[PDB]
Amino acid sequence: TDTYLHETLVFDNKLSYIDNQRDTDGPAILLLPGWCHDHRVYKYLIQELDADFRVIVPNWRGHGLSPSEVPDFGYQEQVKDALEILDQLGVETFLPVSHSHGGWVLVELLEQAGPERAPRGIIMDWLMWAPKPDFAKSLTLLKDPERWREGTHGLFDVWLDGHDEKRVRHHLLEEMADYGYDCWGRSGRVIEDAYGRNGSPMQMMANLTKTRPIRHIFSQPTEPEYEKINSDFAEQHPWFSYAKLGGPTHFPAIDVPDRAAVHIREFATAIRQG
Numbered sequence: 254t255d256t257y258l259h260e261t262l263v264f265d266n267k268l269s270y271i272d273n274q275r276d277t278d279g280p281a282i283l284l285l286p287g288w289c290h291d292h293r294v295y296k297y298l299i300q301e302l303d304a305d306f307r308v309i310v311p312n313w314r315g316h317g318l319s320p321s322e323v324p325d326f327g328y329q330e331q332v333k334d335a336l337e338i339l340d341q342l343g344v345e346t347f348l349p350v351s352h353s354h355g356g357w358v359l360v361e362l363l364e365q366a367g368p369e370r371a372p373r374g375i376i377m378d379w380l381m382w383a384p385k386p387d388f389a390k391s392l393t394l395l396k397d398p399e400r401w402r403e404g405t406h407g408l409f410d411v412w413l414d415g416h417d418e419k420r421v422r423h424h425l426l427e428e429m430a431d432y433g434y435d436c437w438g439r440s441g442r443v444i445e446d447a448y449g450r451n452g453s454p455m456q457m458m459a460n461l462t463k464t465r466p467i468r469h470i471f472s473q474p475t476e477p478e479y480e481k482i483n484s485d486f487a488e489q490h491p492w493f494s495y496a497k498l499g500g501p502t503h504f505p506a507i508d509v510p511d512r513a514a515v516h517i518r519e520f521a522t523a524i525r526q527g
């Protein structure tokens with residue numbers, strides 16, 4: 254799966270990215286990582302989609318197999334980076350698929366690219382409501398140079414949700430091991446700022462200039478009150494749908510890749526039929 258890893262200069266930065274360069278009919282599937290991890294989170298999903306689609310995964314500034322400190326940037330800049338990679342690659346039409354807070358990039362990308370280029374989106378496990386106290390606390394911890402690691406640990410607890418989930422544990426404990434405070438502290442500032450300025454992922458989506466089909470596929474939070482704000486949002490908005498995947502962790506791309514794949518294919522086929 255590292256047979257597909259590339260690197261390129263993007264404005265000021267060398268960014269790594271996955272591209273299987275599959276010669277096939279569009280749309281390209283653009284898999285967008287959350288904060289302080291990289292394309293490795295997608296290694297099982299990429300396998301599900303490899304045969305039939307062109308699959309691109311950009312890594313954000315300072316992210317990759319060798320993380321590095323970089324100057325401060327936000328989702329605005331993640332969006333420009335992603336488009337610049339698509340331009341360099343000649344990719345025209347694409348279906349963006351995001352993980353968690355990679356969603357802020359996805360929804361701004363939909364605005365920027367417009368519905369012709371980006372006609373649909375799939376958002377995975379992304380907190381739809383404004384920060385509850387435990388999560389609000391997590392962010393404040395991430396921002397703290399003394400307590401960022403404690404922040405990440407509390408988040409790992411929430412994400413694993415009491416499961417001995419060997420693939421996810423490996424991703425959190427090994428694949429994110431090289432990320433430091435420069436990343437984690439930034440993710441805290443950006444995510445906090447994102448909800449502050451946009452209200453919520455739902456408010457930001459509802460506010461798109463040109464709304465279009467978006468599906469939220471998620472395994473957590475598992476409580477019925479969270480399902481309820483998804484169903485209420487979907488009752489109000491013909492373009493919004495959701496699917497509870499019932500996977501153990503915050504990482505359906507890792508733990509139920511075959512289920513995440515089928516929703517991606519469904520949206521990719523709807524696009525092919527216009």
Ligand SMILES: Cc1[nH]c2ccccc2c(=O)c1O
Pocket residue numbers: 287288289290352353354440441444503
């Ligand atoms: C990979 C990743 N990174 C984060 C960093 C800060 C806050 C939330 C997250 C998150 O939800 C997620 O999935």
Ligand SMILES: [K+]
Pocket residue numbers: 416417418419
């Ligand atoms: K187990």
Ligand SMILES: [K+]
Pocket residue numbers: 486487488489490491492493494
């Ligand atoms: K709906």
